[PDB]
């Protein structure tokens with residue numbers, strides 16, 4: 001063989017969940033298989049991995065000689081190659097742009113708010129009171145952004161016209177909230193949204209592959 | 215025609231450059247509304263854009279936010295404009311990688327330099343520590359972009375929206391007094407970007423010279 005399938009390196013349950021769902025949708029809707037390599041937090045600090053990707057980040061998508069990082073770049077690339085796959089929830093430019101706007105909001109803005117809850121800023125280590133303040137302020141910021149997504153769901157079923165990469169991104173962040181013990185139950189559209197997303201075959205397959213069921 | 219709401223010299227410079235390229239390359243004019251920090255808190259603005267942020271692109275009854283969504287939307291509408299530095303899927307994606315790095319990763323390190331976290335106001339030592347960490351983060355990320363430019367003249371195969379984004383961030387560094395003279399490629403990169411007609415037009419419109 002002279003052409004191998006595309007390969008995604010990802011951390012199970014991390015933001016790389018999103019291009020994983022994208023590739024599964026491509027497999028299901030355009031019959032193109034792909035490879036998934038689950039990486040550990042240590043393997044990405046490894047010599048072998050930094051030889052592929054100096055930023056030592058996931059996701060990484062390899063397609064032949066192209067070694068592409070950034071979730072948004074990866075998904076827009078898969079959408080150019082496979083428009084029939086409707087990764088942005090639609091084939092039309094205006095509806096695709098609206099879903100891309102939600103994807104960028106989730107990836108650039110909301111994701112960032114989680115950072116201090118996953119890794120406390122070094123200057124608060126050992127400072128009990130500042131640690132509590134930082135964690136509460138970040139929780140408040142997440143919930144403020146999630147209210148905005150909740151408001152959208154008051155009259156839409158998904159963040160695309162049909163299910164899209166943006167729904168995959170919110171889905172995984174609400175999975176983080178559950179794992180972190182961050183209660184969003186007062187945002188009434190979110191739990192029903194989680195259930196709809198989990199019913200999607202590609203999402204289901206990826207949750208299974210990444211070990212995310214409970 | 216389309217209208218862009220932007221804060222002069224802010225991240226909204228990038229879709230402003232994109233529209234000017236569409237103007238120059240695809241013969242489609244657009245409107246630019248410069249907004250103040252107060253106007254984006256206004257009742258009139260919040261009604262258009264409940265997020266109260268810029269950029270905002272209005273195209274008919276489409277009101278689109280987020281820099282990346284805006285530029286991907288214009289690229290779809292005007293592929294001949296080569297907003298990503300190329301027409302081919304692989305080369306466009308490489309440039310979109312850089313755009314996303316600059317928008318999601320690098321821009322974020324600047325945030326505390328423009329707006330200190332609430333918990334740090336009044337606390338002299340902590341404020342100093344937060345500003346130091348931001349500068350260190352920025353310099354590490356700029357070093358990575360600088361390394362790329364040792365073998366490539368732009369972040370696209372030709373000039374692209376990724377280049378515009380790095381350009382405006384280096385303009386912020388100059389305004390913040392964050393020096394990057396030790397990164398040998400950046401000065402020359404800024405001159406190449408300033409030499410492009412679309413960029414030059416936008417810098418003029420936004421009062422940035």
Ligand SMILES: [Cl-]
Nearest residue numbers: 055069070315
């Ligand atoms: Cl990257």
Ligand SMILES: [Cl-]
Nearest residue numbers: 105265279280
């Ligand atoms: Cl937004």
